[PDB]
């Protein structure tokens, strides 16, 4: 009976809430009291990458912390050399409405996807020195919103059909699907050990998945609106969410509840991108008010602003050596900060 | 400076190609097609390896290309997407215009279309995007006959209150009743459009007699008006 199923589930929610309340002995803010603050972080634009025509929707850095790919709605993928601001490749896309891009860990491949519901894989390292689409993965019934390589043969994508899938590049097929979300999934972030990954959807809820199984293990609620971005705290034991409720939060698998909410009265815009620093002390976000904000993850106090963009910041990425921060925006400009 | 030379050469060939790609990109107009009872996309094409489309059965965006007076146009109709458009609509924040086709012959769902048009108009990412209104299926044999009073989505005006506008230009030889009804419905969309819209964006109403008609000239003229208004605003002359 529907009614019975529902009532039982309400009681289950009360039990989960009661169990979560029984673990919140002390607040993270109280524990982090009497701790040195970071201090104002002055940031300057060391490099400015130009060449994109339309708004940039995504960017991903390489594993060498030198090469980065960027996707713009004009239908172009450009691999940059941020050391010298030299364009290395400019792949012409087959569908201009791209919303996500990725860089393979080996550096031999890139991915892109968007309103065409198809993830396309490009072979950067070819014998004749010319990139050309290597595989086109199809099956998603909704816009690809984020794609991230696990290795040269596996890649996880999220889509607007409230499902996430794991694909096999050489087979060409889905190998596992991860269902359970009710709204469109907007972003995912694979973990350091690559065994698990998180995804934020438009149901104001986040889920943790197991690539090698297929089931959601933890479900974290907390936000009031659509989760637009997600990442991972370096250790792999935490993740930060940025939503349209003008509030960033951090979560913990074992805590099974949020730890700290980063908000401000003067901030009423949503968060479009979220990325963590090397050590995880600095949480960088991106906002609809054309700026990005450095957030002290331990004290929930703003410690820097990267104002300089003229339109909405869409993407953000700190490197793997920590030595750079890139921001992309709806003004077709990329910036490197230090 | 031997391999750094090769890099700078590569970067320049790339910049040269990007210049041509910009040249092509700025010379075209991108349009988003919205609605639920439209059939003009299947007749526009006709008007303008093989031709066999190998599009994946799950394609999420369809695209049509047509040229009126050598100005190129790209119209994008959504495909295999879910009902919720709160997030994919943001991608079209820089299109030249939005075509909103509305069935004016089904009075039961006109309110739901009005609500969709209002939501499009008031969206913060589409506040500067002018829309072209296409009142589809204008052949109203429904108001010519009695069954079906227009006093549902209008339990107030057409319901005794709305008189045909004076600026109305009823097409030659046609019942004044259907003229009143269509101009009432048209005013119902324009009421919502002027509620908030100003110099940023305007709404252009057009009574698309079915879909089997010249229909690209309207879009070309409205895009021309939009472009002229934008330019005149940069020179602060409007």
């Amino acid at each position, epitope marked *: 009976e529907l009614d019975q199923l529902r009532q039982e589930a309400e009681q289950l929610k009360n039990q989960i809430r009661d169990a979560r309340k029984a673990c919140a002995d002390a607040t993270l803010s109280q524990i982090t009291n009497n701790i040195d603050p970071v201090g104002r972080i002055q940031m300057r634009t060391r490099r400015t990458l130009r060449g994109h025509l339309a708004k940039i929707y995504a960017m991903h850095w390489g594993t060498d912390s030198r090469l980065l790919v960027s996707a713009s709605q004009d239908g172009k993928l450009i691999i940059w050399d941020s050391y010298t601001t030299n364009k290395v490749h400019a792949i012409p896309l087959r569908s201009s409405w791209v919303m996500t891009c990725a860089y393979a860990p080996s550096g031999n491949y890139v991915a892109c996807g968007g309103l065409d519901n198809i993830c396309s894989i490009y072979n950067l390292k070819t014998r004749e020195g010319n990139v050309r689409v290597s595989r086109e993965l199809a099956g998603h019934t909704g816009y690809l919103s984020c794609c991230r390589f696990l290795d040269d043969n596996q890649i996880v994508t999220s889509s607007g059909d409230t499902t996430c899938a794991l694909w096999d590049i050489e087979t060409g097929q889905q190998t596992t699907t991860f269902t359970g979300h009710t709204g469109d999934v907007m972003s995912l972030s694979l973990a350091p050990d690559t065994r698990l990954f998180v995804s934020g959807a438009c149901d104001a809820s986040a889920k943790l998945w197991d690539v090698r199984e297929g089931m959601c293990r933890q479900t974290f*609620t907390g936000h*009031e*609106s659509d989760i637009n971005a997600i990442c991972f705290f370096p250790n792999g034991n935490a993740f930060a969410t940025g939503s349209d409720d003008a509030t960033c939060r951090l979560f913990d698998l074992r805590a099974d509840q949020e730890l700290m909410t980063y908000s401000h009265d003067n901030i009423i815009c949503g968060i479009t991108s979220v990325s963590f620093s090397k050590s995880g002390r600095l949480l960088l976000a991106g906002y609809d008010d054309f700026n990005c904000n450095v957030w002290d993850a331990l004290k929930a106090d703003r410690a820097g602003v990267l104002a300089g963009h003229d339109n909405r910041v869409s993407c953000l990425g700190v490197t793997d050596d920590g030595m750079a921060v890139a921001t992309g925006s709806w003004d077709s400009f990329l910036k490197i900060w230090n | 400076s031997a391999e750094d030379k090769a890099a700078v050469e590569r970067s320049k060939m790339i910049e040269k190609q990007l210049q041509k790609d910009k040249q092509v990109y700025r010379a075209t107009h991108r349009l988003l097609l919205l609605g639920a009872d439209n059939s003009g996309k299947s007749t526009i094409v006709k008007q303008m390896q093989d031709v066999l489309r190998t599009r994946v059965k799950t394609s999420g965006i369809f695209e049509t290309k047509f040229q009126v007076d050598k100005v190129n146009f790209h119209m994008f109709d959504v495909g295999a997407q879910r009902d919720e458009r709160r997030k994919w609509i943001q991608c079209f924040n820089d299109v030249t215009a939005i075509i909103f086709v509305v069935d004016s012959s089904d009075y039961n769902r006109l309110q*739901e279309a009005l609500n969709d048009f209002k939501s*499009i108009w008031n969206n913060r990412w589409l506040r500067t995007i002018s829309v072209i209104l296409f009142l589809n299926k204008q052949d109203l044999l429904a108001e010519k006959v009695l069954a079906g009073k227009s006093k549902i989505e*209008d339990y*107030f005006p057409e319901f005794a209150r709305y008189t045909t506008p004076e600026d109305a230009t009823p097409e030659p030889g046609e019942d004044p009743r259907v003229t009143r009804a269509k101009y009432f419905i048209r005013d119902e969309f324009l009421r919502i459009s002027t509620a908030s819209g100003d110099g940023r964006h305007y709404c252009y109403p057009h009574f698309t007699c079915s879909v089997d008609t010249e229909n690209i000239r309207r879009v070309f003229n409205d895009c021309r008006d939009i472009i002229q208004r934008m330019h005149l605003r940069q020179y602060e002359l409007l």
Partner: nanobody
Amino acid sequence: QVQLQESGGGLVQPGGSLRLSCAASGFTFSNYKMNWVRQAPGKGLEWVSDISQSGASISYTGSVKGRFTISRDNAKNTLYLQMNSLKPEDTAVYYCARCPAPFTRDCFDVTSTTYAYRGQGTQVTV
């Protein structure tokens, strides 16, 4: 967890009165636009009425204009809908709905049973 719970549905002869209260919990009530939708048997979801953050601007569907009235209690975190002079075409399940983003004028919510921030419903039979 954003949840919204409705109340007040029941059986009444045509021309009677009915009051529907939607209790909100899980979010700042003052920062959101609120709406009302209903689903008649054999028909999809359809918007009814709306109230802004402060309650200044109110709009209603033509079929219920002049009869049903909507109000909100910011302190109590509730949206209300007073119904009078019923006719048997309002036999539907009433879902109290919320707009997705705060401080926003647009509202996409009457979606095909997929919207997350919408109530579970009160059957109203007349």
